[PDB]
Amino acid sequence: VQLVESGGGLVQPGGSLRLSCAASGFTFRNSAMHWVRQAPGKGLEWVSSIWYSGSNTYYADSVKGRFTISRDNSKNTLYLQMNSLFAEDTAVYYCARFAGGWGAYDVWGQGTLVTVSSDIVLTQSPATLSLSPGERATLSCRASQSVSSNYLAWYQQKPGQAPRLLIYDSSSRATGVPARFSGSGSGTDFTLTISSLEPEDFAVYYCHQYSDISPTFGQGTKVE
Amino acid sequence: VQLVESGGGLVQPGGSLRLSCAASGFTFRNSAMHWVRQAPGKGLEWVSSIWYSGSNTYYADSVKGRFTISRDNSKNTLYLQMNSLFAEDTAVYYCARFAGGWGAYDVWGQGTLVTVSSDIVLTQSPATLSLSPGERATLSCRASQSVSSNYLAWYQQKPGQAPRLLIYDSSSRATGVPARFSGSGSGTDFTLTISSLEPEDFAVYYCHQYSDISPTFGQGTKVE
């Protein structure tokens, strides 16, 4: 009584994969067959299901219109067609027989690793500053590699609005940006200061580098 | 100096949607025009780029071949045809004028939301247990809803291995499990006991409900 799984590997975003399990030692035709995945360092989560070539296929929402479950009863094989793969699809995939009141998932595949992957990293600290108006705000943005030409820029976002430009070229202020907003740093230690805080200033602040053709963003520090 | 965005809305997986920025107030036929996007709760992330007639056109890895950026200079318009849309494409979409050393992303569209759209919750405690052999262990699993037919199983998973069925239908110890393992409880309070810890029992333990059409798993308990 066993399921032999096959497939997986490294792909680039937007690629395709197929998985498979062949069942040995039980009645594939009456079993329900499910798929279940575990992201690295995480727990288990269900992907898709199919019954007795019923067919009556069921899919988790994350994978809808991208993934496709199918079975070949004559070949005792379950499949999972995986299209337009996203980084978020990275995980160990298992096939499992569903026994219901008679075993739950009693037969498991061993697991195959499906990894999706393809650069300057911006790291803001802290994630959160609780300050009061008038107080100073000092946001760090540290780069994994030196930002040439000091092509680093800060934006501000207020909920439901587009982002607003603040500093560009490290320390150059934008069209209509108050002087309490200061940008400084060079190379990889950039730092935005708000010398005293205004009530409107309470928002999320992102940093941005355009020193290459792959533009990147920090995660935002939030100010409260 | 303006970008007037239009388009978007709610679509089902595999749907189609074209966006539009109409340019006013500058020499549009010569500007570098980008598209940027923010998925709800997350931060900014670049999407696409277009510039003069002898320039390249750039797409983020996760969109290539589905989205198509274009432009009608004669009508001062930027487009983004989006095809084969999927949940992970759910986000607010912005157009922006790129200024580089002269200001980076210095003009934006207001943004339009694009949403692509077509459960019992198990909670384990404690999350970690450091014990020595001979001691007894006690692992909880609570169900947000009530598990019908007490259709709740327990699995063991060791370092990098598929999981192993321990208990099912609440209390049924699977063929081959030491009798120091017992599962008990019903409704929403299930609990599994390991009465004399052998060293080989040290691993992670999951729980699972198959009562409904959307199976679910607890987070796991680590026993050390």
Side-chain angles (χ1 to χ4, degrees):
Chain A
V1 167
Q2 200 186 20
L3 290 148
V4 167
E5 203 183 346
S6 71
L10 191 48
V11 262
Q12 345 282 27
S16 291
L17 244 40
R18 206 175 47 147
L19 309 203
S20 301
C21 320
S24 80
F26 67 82
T27 304
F28 192 64
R29 303 182 303 96
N30 300 137
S31 280
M33 290 309 312
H34 290 198
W35 284 105
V36 179
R37 73 181 182 197
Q38 181 176 16
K42 297 277 298 181
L44 300 157
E45 105 176 35
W46 167 83
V47 175
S48 179
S49 83
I50 186 173
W51 194 358
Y52 65 77
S53 219
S55 33
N56 320 48
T57 59
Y58 301 86
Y59 304 85
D61 269 9
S62 45
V63 323
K64 282 203 177 196
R66 295 186 296 126
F67 293 12
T68 301
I69 193 170
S70 61
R71 64 194 294 146
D72 202 314
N73 288 333
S74 78
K75 276 99 190 91
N76 283 348
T77 306
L78 185 72
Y79 313 101
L80 177 61
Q81 178 66 52
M82 298 170 91
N83 293 2
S84 340
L85 287 161
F86 300 111
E88 297 98 7
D89 293 350
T90 299
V92 174
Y93 290 70
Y94 310 88
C95 42
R97 198 270 291 278
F98 181 59
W102 270 271
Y105 292 126
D106 51 332
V107 192
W108 291 77
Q110 44 180 323
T112 179
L113 189 56
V114 174
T115 303
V116 200
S117 216
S118 319
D119 220 40
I120 298 180
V121 154
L122 305 194
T123 310
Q124 329 208 199
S125 46
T128 294
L129 288 159
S130 266
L131 303 146
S132 336
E135 278 177 353
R136 153 179 313 292
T138 317
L139 282 59
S140 212
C141 178
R142 280 169 190 243
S144 46
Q145 323 144 30
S146 160
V147 165
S148 29
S149 305
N150 293 308
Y151 274 7
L152 185 123
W154 292 90
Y155 304 72
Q156 181 199 75
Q157 203 167 35
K158 279 134 157 184
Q161 309 164 10
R164 171 198 165 207
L165 189 69
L166 293 203
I167 312 281
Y168 67 92
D169 298 12
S170 218
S171 24
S172 303
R173 225 131 45 200
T175 170
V177 178
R180 65 184 181 282
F181 293 109
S182 191
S184 91
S186 356
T188 81
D189 187 27
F190 307 93
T191 147
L192 175 85
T193 305
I194 316 134
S195 44
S196 72
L197 276 168
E198 285 309 321
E200 57 277 23
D201 296 330
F202 287 76
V204 171
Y205 294 81
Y206 299 94
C207 52
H208 170 209
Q209 68 77 24
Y210 45 112
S211 54
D212 52 16
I213 53 147
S214 275
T216 73
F217 299 79
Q219 278 332 306
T221 296
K222 194 185 189 203
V223 191
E224 337 185 304
Chain B
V1 201
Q2 257 202 335
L3 294 167
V4 172
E5 198 175 8
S6 49
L10 186 55
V11 279
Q12 276 62 67
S16 241
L17 236 45
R18 176 183 99 185
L19 311 176
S20 250
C21 289
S24 356
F26 66 101
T27 309
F28 166 75
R29 50 146 139 90
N30 300 341
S31 282
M33 305 297 297
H34 292 199
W35 284 110
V36 172
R37 81 150 167 238
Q38 196 173 15
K42 300 274 160 46
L44 304 160
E45 169 192 29
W46 165 81
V47 184
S48 188
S49 289
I50 188 178
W51 205 346
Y52 54 93
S53 172
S55 72
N56 292 333
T57 297
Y58 292 120
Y59 299 104
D61 284 349
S62 69
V63 300
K64 311 199 194 191
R66 303 185 284 128
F67 300 181
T68 294
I69 200 173
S70 67
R71 62 197 302 151
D72 179 9
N73 297 322
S74 100
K75 223 170 314 310
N76 276 335
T77 315
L78 177 64
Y79 305 96
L80 182 65
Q81 187 70 41
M82 315 158 82
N83 298 0
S84 309
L85 277 160
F86 301 124
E88 299 74 8
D89 299 317
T90 278
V92 163
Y93 286 78
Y94 305 106
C95 59
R97 207 266 304 271
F98 185 53
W102 290 352
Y105 281 137
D106 72 321
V107 183
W108 302 69
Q110 47 179 102
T112 184
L113 178 48
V114 164
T115 295
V116 176
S117 194
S118 53
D119 269 23
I120 303 171
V121 179
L122 313 180
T123 0
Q124 316 211 198
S125 41
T128 299
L129 249 183
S130 280
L131 298 158
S132 40
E135 285 155 12
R136 163 175 320 222
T138 303
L139 287 67
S140 311
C141 176
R142 287 199 281 87
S144 78
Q145 298 172 27
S146 168
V147 194
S148 67
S149 311
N150 292 313
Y151 266 9
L152 179 124
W154 286 90
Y155 301 86
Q156 180 191 68
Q157 182 182 48
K158 279 184 200 164
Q161 288 147 26
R164 171 204 181 198
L165 177 72
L166 277 218
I167 315 286
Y168 74 110
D169 295 330
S170 168
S171 61
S172 280
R173 186 169 74 235
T175 330
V177 181
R180 57 195 163 81
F181 285 100
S182 59
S184 59
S186 82
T188 68
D189 177 38
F190 309 91
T191 132
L192 158 86
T193 313
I194 317 160
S195 65
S196 212
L197 275 176
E198 322 288 331
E200 67 261 7
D201 305 306
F202 289 89
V204 179
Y205 293 81
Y206 292 88
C207 62
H208 164 37
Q209 61 85 4
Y210 42 110
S211 49
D212 60 4
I213 196 77
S214 312
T216 65
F217 299 84
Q219 337 297 355
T221 303
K222 190 167 187 185
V223 194
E224 304 175 327

XYZ file of all heavy atoms in Angstrom, chain A residues 52-132:
624
model
N -13.468 9.127 -7.939
C -13.866 8.001 -8.793
C -14.008 8.358 -10.275
O -14.848 7.785 -10.976
C -15.144 7.279 -8.303
C -16.521 7.996 -8.280
C -17.269 8.201 -9.442
C -17.126 8.355 -7.071
C -18.541 8.809 -9.400
C -18.385 8.966 -7.020
C -19.091 9.189 -8.185
O -20.339 9.785 -8.134
N -13.161 9.261 -10.779
C -13.339 9.838 -12.117
C -14.752 10.391 -12.264
O -15.275 10.517 -13.375
C -13.035 8.821 -13.221
O -12.343 9.407 -14.314
N -15.365 10.713 -11.124
C -16.719 11.237 -11.018
C -17.298 12.136 -12.095
O -18.354 11.821 -12.632
N -16.637 13.249 -12.418
C -15.338 13.619 -11.867
C -15.488 14.448 -10.601
O -14.996 14.064 -9.534
C -14.518 14.371 -12.909
O -15.359 15.154 -13.741
N -16.200 15.568 -10.718
C -16.481 16.433 -9.577
C -15.192 16.948 -8.936
O -14.872 16.614 -7.791
C -17.345 15.708 -8.539
C -18.446 14.854 -9.156
O -18.225 14.075 -10.077
N -19.647 14.999 -8.626
N -14.442 17.758 -9.682
C -13.155 18.233 -9.189
C -13.330 19.456 -8.299
O -14.178 20.314 -8.551
C -12.227 18.544 -10.363
O -12.838 19.539 -11.191
C -11.997 17.289 -11.196
N -12.536 19.510 -7.233
C -12.521 20.622 -6.294
C -11.105 21.148 -6.148
O -10.155 20.366 -6.039
C -13.016 20.212 -4.918
C -14.416 19.674 -4.905
C -14.664 18.333 -5.148
C -15.488 20.500 -4.632
C -15.934 17.840 -5.130
C -16.760 20.013 -4.614
C -16.981 18.685 -4.865
O -18.260 18.190 -4.848
N -10.980 22.473 -6.101
C -9.693 23.144 -6.020
C -9.710 24.200 -4.925
O -10.724 24.862 -4.689
C -9.341 23.823 -7.330
C -9.340 22.936 -8.554
C -10.509 22.677 -9.257
C -8.159 22.392 -9.034
C -10.501 21.886 -10.405
C -8.141 21.601 -10.173
C -9.313 21.353 -10.859
O -9.298 20.565 -11.994
N -8.572 24.368 -4.265
C -8.413 25.517 -3.392
C -8.429 26.798 -4.219
O -8.095 26.806 -5.408
C -7.116 25.420 -2.591
N -8.835 27.893 -3.581
C -9.032 29.133 -4.318
C -7.724 29.649 -4.885
O -7.691 30.206 -5.987
C -9.686 30.173 -3.414
C -11.186 30.145 -3.508
O -11.715 29.211 -4.149
O -11.836 31.050 -2.942
N -6.627 29.457 -4.154
C -5.350 30.002 -4.594
C -4.954 29.490 -5.970
O -4.226 30.172 -6.705
C -4.262 29.670 -3.568
O -4.343 28.312 -3.162
N -5.443 28.319 -6.355
C -4.917 27.634 -7.520
C -5.945 27.572 -8.647
O -5.763 26.829 -9.616
C -4.395 26.238 -7.138
C -3.746 26.288 -5.763
C -5.497 25.193 -7.153
N -7.001 28.375 -8.565
C -8.136 28.217 -9.470
C -7.828 28.795 -10.845
O -7.278 29.899 -10.960
C -9.388 28.851 -8.877
C -10.040 27.988 -7.801
C -11.500 28.341 -7.637
C -12.215 27.466 -6.631
N -13.683 27.635 -6.825
N -8.181 28.039 -11.891
C -7.923 28.446 -13.250
C -6.472 28.375 -13.648
O -6.165 28.557 -14.831
N -5.578 28.134 -12.690
C -4.183 27.781 -12.944
C -3.910 26.290 -12.831
O -3.264 25.714 -13.710
C -3.262 28.504 -11.965
C -3.240 29.985 -12.095
C -2.195 30.600 -11.187
N -2.457 30.385 -9.768
C -1.580 29.845 -8.924
N -0.383 29.465 -9.356
N -1.889 29.693 -7.640
N -4.368 25.651 -11.758
C -4.145 24.228 -11.550
C -5.326 23.425 -12.079
O -6.441 23.930 -12.231
C -3.923 23.896 -10.072
C -2.645 24.453 -9.493
C -1.889 25.396 -10.178
C -2.194 24.011 -8.259
C -0.726 25.896 -9.635
C -1.043 24.512 -7.708
C -0.303 25.455 -8.397
N -5.060 22.151 -12.356
C -6.040 21.243 -12.940
C -5.738 19.847 -12.437
O -4.657 19.310 -12.711
C -5.996 21.270 -14.467
O -6.260 22.593 -14.928
C -7.026 20.337 -15.045
N -6.690 19.268 -11.724
C -6.560 17.912 -11.208
C -7.256 16.958 -12.158
O -8.306 17.266 -12.731
C -7.122 17.807 -9.780
C -6.709 16.497 -9.127
C -8.622 17.944 -9.778
C -7.035 16.472 -7.647
N -6.643 15.801 -12.353
C -7.191 14.793 -13.240
C -6.625 13.442 -12.834
O -5.586 13.352 -12.175
C -6.866 15.098 -14.703
O -5.467 15.112 -14.909
N -7.330 12.390 -13.228
C -6.912 11.040 -12.907
C -7.088 10.160 -14.126
O -7.938 10.413 -14.980
C -7.718 10.462 -11.759
C -9.187 10.308 -12.107
C -10.014 10.052 -10.865
N -9.666 8.768 -10.285
C -9.675 8.520 -8.982
N -10.020 9.478 -8.123
N -9.334 7.315 -8.542
N -6.274 9.125 -14.195
C -6.420 8.074 -15.193
C -6.676 6.792 -14.414
O -5.747 6.225 -13.835
C -5.174 7.974 -16.062
C -5.444 7.319 -17.383
O -6.128 6.268 -17.396
O -4.980 7.865 -18.408
N -7.935 6.356 -14.356
C -8.237 5.128 -13.628
C -7.551 3.927 -14.254
O -7.120 3.016 -13.543
C -9.737 4.895 -13.580
C -10.427 5.838 -12.665
O -9.846 6.339 -11.704
N -11.688 6.089 -12.946
N -7.445 3.907 -15.585
C -6.802 2.784 -16.260
C -5.307 2.729 -15.972
O -4.711 1.647 -16.027
C -7.042 2.860 -17.771
O -6.193 3.817 -18.382
N -4.685 3.866 -15.671
C -3.262 3.922 -15.370
C -2.973 4.172 -13.895
O -1.827 4.465 -13.546
C -2.575 4.996 -16.220
C -2.176 4.529 -17.607
C -3.191 4.949 -18.650
C -2.929 4.272 -19.985
N -3.662 2.981 -20.115
N -3.977 4.066 -13.026
C -3.836 4.264 -11.583
C -3.007 5.480 -11.205
O -2.285 5.447 -10.202
C -3.224 3.030 -10.926
C -4.214 1.910 -10.776
O -5.414 2.103 -10.957
N -3.721 0.727 -10.427
N -3.125 6.559 -11.980
C -2.317 7.757 -11.800
C -3.198 8.966 -11.525
O -4.192 9.198 -12.223
C -1.446 8.033 -13.024
O -0.678 6.870 -13.323
C -0.483 9.164 -12.734
N -2.820 9.720 -10.499
C -3.337 11.045 -10.213
C -2.372 12.084 -10.774
O -1.154 11.891 -10.711
C -3.464 11.221 -8.706
C -4.085 12.496 -8.179
C -5.578 12.459 -8.466
C -3.790 12.626 -6.694
N -2.907 13.189 -11.312
C -2.087 14.310 -11.778
C -2.518 15.634 -11.158
O -3.641 15.801 -10.668
C -2.127 14.489 -13.308
C -1.936 13.220 -14.116
C -3.019 12.565 -14.672
C -0.668 12.697 -14.339
C -2.852 11.431 -15.418
C -0.491 11.557 -15.085
C -1.589 10.927 -15.615
O -1.426 9.783 -16.354
N -1.599 16.590 -11.228
C -1.864 17.975 -10.850
C -1.122 18.849 -11.852
O 0.101 18.983 -11.777
C -1.413 18.270 -9.427
C -1.611 19.734 -9.065
C -3.093 20.041 -9.171
C -1.066 20.044 -7.678
N -1.855 19.417 -12.801
C -1.261 20.325 -13.772
C -1.137 21.716 -13.165
O -2.126 22.272 -12.675
C -2.112 20.366 -15.038
C -1.616 21.309 -16.099
C -0.288 20.884 -16.685
O -0.123 19.749 -17.128
N 0.667 21.801 -16.695
N 0.073 22.283 -13.203
C 0.375 23.538 -12.508
C 0.834 24.613 -13.493
O 1.977 24.599 -13.954
C 1.422 23.302 -11.429
C 0.974 22.367 -10.363
S 2.366 21.937 -9.337
C 2.235 23.187 -8.095
N -0.038 25.566 -13.792
C 0.272 26.603 -14.763
C 0.378 27.973 -14.101
O -0.222 28.237 -13.058
C -0.771 26.632 -15.881
C -0.721 25.399 -16.735
O 0.071 24.492 -16.490
N -1.571 25.348 -17.748
N 1.177 28.838 -14.726
C 1.412 30.193 -14.247
C 1.830 30.177 -12.780
O 1.159 30.703 -11.898
C 0.163 31.037 -14.452
O -0.641 30.417 -15.438
N 2.965 29.536 -12.545
C 3.445 29.334 -11.190
C 3.997 30.630 -10.610
O 4.756 31.349 -11.264
C 4.496 28.229 -11.178
C 3.897 26.833 -11.383
C 4.964 25.834 -11.838
C 3.185 26.339 -10.110
N 3.606 30.923 -9.380
C 4.055 32.092 -8.652
C 5.009 31.679 -7.541
O 5.018 30.530 -7.104
C 2.858 32.838 -8.064
C 1.876 33.327 -9.095
C 0.614 32.773 -9.190
C 2.210 34.351 -9.961
C -0.290 33.232 -10.134
C 1.312 34.805 -10.904
C 0.063 34.243 -10.991
N 5.822 32.636 -7.084
C 6.724 32.361 -5.971
C 5.966 31.754 -4.815
O 6.451 30.832 -4.148
C 7.419 33.642 -5.520
N 4.748 32.242 -4.590
C 3.886 31.769 -3.518
C 3.559 30.282 -3.620
O 3.046 29.712 -2.651
C 2.590 32.589 -3.509
C 2.785 34.076 -3.214
C 2.822 34.942 -4.455
O 2.561 34.421 -5.554
O 3.107 36.151 -4.323
N 3.822 29.644 -4.753
C 3.526 28.229 -4.895
C 4.655 27.349 -4.394
O 4.537 26.126 -4.461
C 3.170 27.909 -6.354
C 1.858 28.571 -6.774
O 1.170 29.088 -5.880
O 1.496 28.585 -7.969
N 5.711 27.940 -3.843
C 6.871 27.181 -3.391
C 6.530 26.378 -2.139
O 6.144 26.956 -1.120
C 8.035 28.130 -3.111
O 8.406 28.823 -4.313
C 9.223 27.359 -2.593
N 6.685 25.050 -2.209
C 6.287 24.147 -1.125
C 6.541 22.688 -1.469
O 6.715 22.349 -2.640
C 4.796 24.295 -0.782
N 6.531 21.823 -0.459
C 6.515 20.378 -0.678
C 5.091 19.950 -0.997
O 4.157 20.251 -0.245
C 7.044 19.626 0.552
C 6.871 18.130 0.363
C 8.492 19.947 0.772
N 4.925 19.240 -2.105
C 3.624 18.724 -2.509
C 3.549 17.223 -2.241
O 4.454 16.473 -2.630
C 3.376 19.021 -3.986
C 3.143 20.488 -4.259
C 4.175 21.406 -4.137
C 1.889 20.960 -4.634
C 3.966 22.746 -4.374
C 1.674 22.299 -4.874
C 2.720 23.190 -4.746
O 2.538 24.534 -4.983
N 2.477 16.790 -1.569
C 2.215 15.378 -1.313
C 0.917 14.967 -1.985
O -0.039 15.745 -2.022
C 2.072 15.071 0.176
C 3.149 15.582 1.106
C 3.073 16.852 1.670
C 4.206 14.774 1.471
C 4.051 17.300 2.550
C 5.178 15.214 2.335
C 5.098 16.468 2.874
O 6.077 16.895 3.741
N 0.871 13.742 -2.504
C -0.415 13.127 -2.802
C -0.836 12.250 -1.649
O -0.002 11.645 -0.974
C -0.420 12.286 -4.066
S 0.985 11.275 -4.315
N -2.145 12.192 -1.442
C -2.726 11.501 -0.315
C -4.053 10.898 -0.753
O -4.831 11.523 -1.489
C -2.892 12.444 0.891
N -4.252 9.644 -0.358
C -5.520 8.957 -0.492
C -6.440 9.430 0.617
O -6.018 9.526 1.774
C -5.295 7.457 -0.380
C -6.428 6.618 -0.905
C -7.438 6.305 0.155
N -6.924 5.402 1.171
C -6.879 4.087 1.024
N -7.282 3.540 -0.118
N -6.418 3.332 2.007
N -7.690 9.737 0.270
C -8.669 10.170 1.259
C -9.612 9.015 1.579
O -10.333 8.534 0.697
C -9.460 11.395 0.792
C -10.448 11.872 1.814
C -10.019 12.253 3.072
C -11.803 11.902 1.538
C -10.922 12.665 4.034
C -12.727 12.315 2.506
C -12.285 12.693 3.758
N -9.604 8.580 2.845
C -10.378 7.435 3.306
C -11.641 7.834 4.070
O -12.497 6.979 4.324
C -9.500 6.524 4.188
N -11.781 9.096 4.438
C -13.010 9.513 5.086
C -13.135 8.943 6.480
O -12.190 8.965 7.280
N -14.325 8.426 6.785
C -14.524 7.803 8.075
C -13.707 6.560 8.304
O -13.846 5.932 9.353
N -12.848 6.195 7.357
C -12.127 4.933 7.396
C -10.618 5.132 7.400
O -9.880 4.187 7.131
C -12.528 4.048 6.220
C -13.699 3.160 6.535
C -13.653 1.899 7.072
C -15.088 3.470 6.361
N -14.927 1.408 7.238
C -15.825 2.351 6.810
C -15.777 4.581 5.867
C -17.214 2.309 6.774
C -17.164 4.539 5.836
C -17.865 3.409 6.288
N -10.129 6.341 7.700
C -8.681 6.575 7.666
C -8.206 7.976 7.422
O -7.003 8.229 7.494
N -9.102 8.900 7.091
C -8.706 10.282 6.798
C -7.725 10.222 5.631
O -8.071 9.619 4.598
C -8.182 10.931 8.074
N -6.528 10.822 5.728
C -5.431 10.632 4.769
C -4.559 9.521 5.322
O -3.654 9.769 6.118
C -4.592 11.892 4.600
C -5.282 13.061 3.928
C -5.332 14.316 4.530
C -5.885 12.910 2.683
C -5.962 15.395 3.897
C -6.517 13.971 2.050
C -6.558 15.205 2.657
O -7.193 16.232 1.995
N -4.826 8.278 4.909
C -4.038 7.171 5.428
C -2.812 6.850 4.571
O -1.839 6.301 5.098
C -4.922 5.925 5.597
C -5.712 5.585 4.346
O -5.999 6.521 3.574
O -6.051 4.393 4.140
N -2.806 7.187 3.280
C -1.664 6.928 2.399
C -1.129 8.256 1.855
O -1.877 9.022 1.238
C -2.040 5.984 1.248
C -0.792 5.500 0.550
C -2.829 4.823 1.778
N 0.170 8.501 2.045
C 0.835 9.738 1.641
C 1.970 9.486 0.655
O 2.693 8.485 0.743
C 1.445 10.477 2.837
C 0.471 11.056 3.757
C -0.261 10.398 4.682
C 0.116 12.430 3.862
N -1.065 11.276 5.370
C -0.851 12.535 4.882
C 0.526 13.587 3.201
C -1.417 13.746 5.254
C -0.036 14.791 3.574
C -0.997 14.863 4.590
N 2.142 10.432 -0.266
C 3.379 10.514 -1.011
C 4.512 11.005 -0.131
O 4.307 11.557 0.946
N 5.741 10.786 -0.583
C 6.880 11.196 0.223
C 7.111 12.698 0.194
O 7.696 13.246 1.137
C 8.136 10.475 -0.250
C 8.299 10.418 -1.753
C 9.574 9.693 -2.147
O 10.610 9.813 -1.487
N 9.503 8.945 -3.240
N 6.652 13.376 -0.850
C 6.861 14.804 -0.954
C 7.867 15.160 -2.028
O 8.922 14.520 -2.139
N 7.542 16.157 -2.847
C 8.501 16.738 -3.777
C 8.510 18.248 -3.621
O 7.465 18.876 -3.396
C 8.212 16.383 -5.245
O 9.187 17.019 -6.084
C 6.827 16.845 -5.659
N 9.701 18.820 -3.736
C 9.873 20.259 -3.584
C 9.643 20.957 -4.918
O 10.356 20.698 -5.901
C 11.262 20.583 -3.050
C 11.385 22.046 -2.673
C 10.299 22.349 -1.668
C 12.734 22.293 -2.065
N 8.638 21.823 -4.953
C 8.401 22.729 -6.071
C 8.821 24.115 -5.610
O 8.169 24.689 -4.730
C 6.933 22.715 -6.512
C 6.674 23.779 -7.573
C 6.572 21.342 -7.017
N 9.915 24.642 -6.179
C 10.392 25.994 -5.873
C 10.252 26.923 -7.079
O 10.611 26.553 -8.201
C 11.844 25.970 -5.403
O 11.959 25.111 -4.260
C 12.265 27.359 -5.002
N 9.708 28.121 -6.855
C 9.584 29.142 -7.899
C 10.432 30.353 -7.520
O 10.274 30.913 -6.423
C 8.123 29.555 -8.138
C 7.992 30.201 -9.502
C 7.219 28.355 -8.050
N 11.317 30.763 -8.439
C 12.281 31.826 -8.177
C 12.811 32.375 -9.496
O 12.584 31.809 -10.567
C 13.424 31.312 -7.310
O 13.858 32.300 -6.404
N 13.540 33.490 -9.397
C 14.142 34.166 -10.554
C 15.673 34.146 -10.508
O 16.295 34.785 -9.655
C 13.659 35.613 -10.639
O 12.281 35.712 -10.335
N 20.005 41.203 -7.078
C 18.939 42.210 -7.013
C 18.954 43.011 -5.697
O 19.147 42.445 -4.622
C 17.589 41.537 -7.196
C 16.658 42.351 -8.052
O 17.139 42.938 -9.050
O 15.453 42.404 -7.729
N 18.728 44.322 -5.786
C 19.034 45.238 -4.684
C 17.915 45.190 -3.658
O 16.753 45.428 -3.990
C 19.240 46.682 -5.179
C 20.433 46.801 -6.134
C 19.476 47.627 -3.999
C 20.664 48.217 -6.634
N 18.272 44.955 -2.401
C 17.305 44.779 -1.321
C 17.295 46.005 -0.414
O 18.349 46.457 0.047
C 17.612 43.507 -0.523
C 17.083 43.632 0.880
C 17.004 42.354 -1.234
N 16.097 46.523 -0.134
C 15.901 47.670 0.747
C 15.273 47.187 2.048
O 14.234 46.522 2.024
C 15.019 48.726 0.085
C 15.454 49.261 -1.281
C 14.688 50.541 -1.645
C 16.951 49.493 -1.313
N 15.899 47.524 3.177
C 15.487 47.034 4.492
C 15.248 48.227 5.410
O 16.197 48.930 5.777
C 16.536 46.091 5.089
O 16.894 45.084 4.129
C 16.007 45.420 6.351
N 13.981 48.441 5.787
C 13.580 49.563 6.627
C 13.414 49.114 8.067
O 12.916 48.020 8.333
C 12.279 50.184 6.135
C 12.096 50.068 4.644
C 11.257 51.184 4.095
O 10.710 51.084 2.994
N 11.153 52.267 4.860
N 13.851 49.962 8.986
C 13.673 49.728 10.409
C 13.407 51.061 11.090
O 13.875 52.103 10.612
C 14.896 49.046 11.012
O 16.093 49.672 10.581
N 12.598 51.042 12.164
C 11.859 49.843 12.563
C 10.685 49.649 11.630
O 10.493 50.495 10.753
C 11.371 50.164 13.979
C 11.936 51.490 14.323
C 12.308 52.174 13.053
N 9.929 48.558 11.796
C 8.684 48.424 11.046
C 7.680 49.457 11.502
O 6.807 49.871 10.728
C 8.091 47.029 11.210
N 7.806 49.896 12.742
C 6.778 50.717 13.341
C 7.437 51.608 14.361
O 8.287 51.151 15.135
C 5.702 49.854 14.000
O 5.005 49.121 12.985
C 4.711 50.712 14.806
N 7.070 52.888 14.302
C 7.389 53.887 15.310
C 6.070 54.464 15.791
O 5.297 54.989 14.983
C 8.280 54.995 14.738
C 9.732 54.641 14.426
C 10.322 55.612 13.421
C 10.514 54.665 15.711
N 5.794 54.320 17.085
C 4.738 55.081 17.741
C 5.386 56.347 18.280
O 6.154 56.301 19.246
C 4.065 54.282 18.858
O 2.891 53.602 18.419
N 5.108 57.470 17.635
C 5.561 58.761 18.115
C 4.365 59.701 18.235
O 3.261 59.429 17.751
C 6.637 59.368 17.194
C 7.922 58.572 16.910
C 8.395 58.831 15.502
C 9.032 58.902 17.896
N 4.602 60.797 18.900
C 3.669 61.877 19.062
C 4.088 63.044 18.179
O 5.280 63.208 17.894
C 3.645 62.320 20.525
O 4.088 61.248 21.341
